[PDB]
């Protein structure tokens, strides 16, 4: 996903169902 949760939880990618992992939002794809 195009969002890093390093300092903040997924926002745009949150709507995509992106989960925070290794400080970066992922959901099958980055």
One-character DSSP codes across 15-26: HTT-EEETTEEE
Within 13 Å and on the Cβ side, how many CA atoms surround 12?
Answer: 5
CB 25 within 8 A of CB 19: yes
Which domain range does residue 11 map to? 1-30
Neighbours of 5 (CB within 10 A): 20
Residues 6+ apart with CB under 8 A from 21: none
Please list the helix, strand and coil fractions of the chain in percent, rounded to the nearest 5, in that order. 15, 25, 60
CB 25 within 8 A of CB 5: yes
Three-class DSSP category at 28? coil
CB 28 within 8 A of CB 17: no
Handedness of CA 12, 17, 24, 5 (dihedral sign): positive
Rounded to whole angstroms, the Cα distance separating 6 from 12 reads 15
Domains: count for the chain: 1
């Amino acid at each position: 996903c195009a969002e890093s949760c390093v300092y903040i939880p997924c926002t745009v990618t949150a709507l995509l169902g992106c989960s925070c992992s290794n400080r970066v939002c992922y959901n099958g794809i980055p």
